[PDB]
């Protein structure tokens, strides 16, 4: 049912998300499982030796394997095509220090595969190199993702920067009435409460309930987008006493597919907090946790496919994502507690976005 590579990409990106979620247990996190898989799929082409092994081992595939590069290319083009209706602004980029002899033939080879190019910049001009990179990222995200590199992120010694940014403000197939949006009490994991804008809509929603292995029931709702291609999945334990982590730790691309397959439409009243999350994740620690350590270590990093004439290592590997959820006697579903969301491309089964709303 899913694309073989879409599954590999999604499963990989999900494992990375779980690493971020475990690190920031009680903070908001919005992440792109597909984005991180994609930028790391590209990194495979620049990477060699042990550094490549670690990435390949973690992703479950080699950009080397036959048809693997086309597959990703087709997947991307499928996700970003006009037929989707619901726009997704995304960008990735490898920035390399200028005046470093690159492996003759790599540039055009990288382009033939991913239809992107490696950008060369002078990190010597720290603040200029930083603006060049940030303005690129903003320019290629409808101007939505700004300042992806904060002051200090890069210095005159930076030689390789890895960047990925996404913005999504989708429009629901069935919109929430503006009039129903009101301030409502949200219960945070620590037991405290804040009053936040929540949307309300009675409709025949896609819904189903799963149990955690330990037997805790949790609600899952699917909110399709007007393009009939993407869907948001909202999931959270029914019992507030059960932490959201109980879901995040069992999460997988495959589980989400089962959620979808078990959905039935039922007259429901959904109260869902209106929210706008922006998050930058430093991919280093999460990726290191998954066995990919070489790529960040100066002289141990093997990027000999990109440049064998001079040592390289990733100074920064950063993803920044902005997601906005807005308006665009039946059973009552109130998301007044920390919950997961998943944005999914259903035709391919790709997990584009994933996040936890710990505090709207
Ligand atoms: Cl919680
Ligand atoms: Zn299955």
Curated annotation (Swiss-Prot):
It comes from Homo sapiens (Human). This is Plasminogen activator inhibitor 1. Serine protease inhibitor. Inhibits TMPRSS7. Is a primary inhibitor of tissue-type plasminogen activator (PLAT) and urokinase-type plasminogen activator (PLAU). As PLAT inhibitor, it is required for fibrinolysis down-regulation and is responsible for the controlled degradation of blood clots. As PLAU inhibitor, it is involved in the regulation of cell adhesion and spreading. Acts as a regulator of cell migration, independently of its role as protease inhibitor. It is required for stimulation of keratinocyte migration during cutaneous injury repair. Belongs to the serpin family. The keyword Signal applies. InterPro entries: Serpin_CS, Serpin_dom, Serpin_fam, Serpin_sf, Serpin_sf_1, Serpin_sf_2. Inactivated by proteolytic attack of the urokinase-type (u-PA) and the tissue-type (TPA), cleaving the 369-Arg-|-Met-370 bond. Pfam families: Serpin. SMART domains: SERPIN. It is found in: Secreted.
């Amino acid at each position: 049912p899913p694309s073989y590579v879409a599954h590999l990409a999604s499963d990989f990106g999900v494992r990375v998300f779980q690493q971020v979620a475990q690190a920031s247990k009680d903070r908001n996190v919005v992440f792109s499982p597909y984005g991180v898989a994609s930028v790391l799929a590209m990194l495979q082409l620049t990477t060699g030796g042990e550094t490549q092994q670690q990435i390949q081992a973690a992703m479950g595939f080699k950009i080397d394997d036959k048809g693997m590069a086309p597959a990703l290319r087709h997947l991307y083009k499928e996700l970003m095509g006009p037929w989707n209706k619901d726009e997704i602004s995304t960008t990735d980029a490898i920035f390399v220090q200028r005046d470093l002899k690159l492996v003759q033939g790599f540039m055009p080879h990288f382009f033939r595969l991913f239809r992107s190019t490696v950008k060369q910049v002078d990190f010597s001009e720290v603040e200029r190199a930083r603006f060049i990179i940030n303005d690129w990222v903003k320019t290629h995200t409808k101007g939505m993702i700004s300042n992806l590199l904060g002051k200090g992120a890069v210095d005159q010694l930076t030689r390789l920067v890895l960047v990925n940014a996404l913005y999504f403000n989708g429009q629901f197939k069935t919109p929430f009435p503006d009039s129903s949006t009101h301030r409502r009490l949200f219960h945070k994991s620590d037991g405290s409460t804040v009053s936040v804008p929540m949307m309300a809509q009675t409709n025949k929603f896609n819904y189903t309930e799963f149990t955690t292995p330990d037997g805790h029931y949790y609600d899952i709702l699917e909110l399709p987008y007007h393009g009939d291609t993407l869907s948001m999945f909202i999931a959270a334990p029914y019992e507030k006493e059960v932490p959201l982590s109980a879901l995040t730790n069992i999460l997988s691309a495959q589980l989400i597919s089962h959620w979808k397959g078990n959905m039935t439409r039922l007259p429901r009243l959904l109260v869902l907090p209106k929210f706008s999350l922006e998050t930058e994740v430093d991919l280093r620690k999460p990726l290191e946790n998954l066995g990919m350590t070489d790529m960040f270590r100066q002289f141990q990093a093997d990027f000999t496919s990109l440049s064998d004439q001079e040592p390289l290592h990733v100074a920064q590997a950063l993803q920044k994502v902005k997601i906005e959820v807005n308006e665009s006697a039946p059973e009552e579903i109130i998301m007044d507690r920390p919950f997961l969301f998943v944005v999914r491309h259903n035709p391919t089964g790709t997990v584009l976005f994933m996040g936890q709303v710990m505090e709207p």
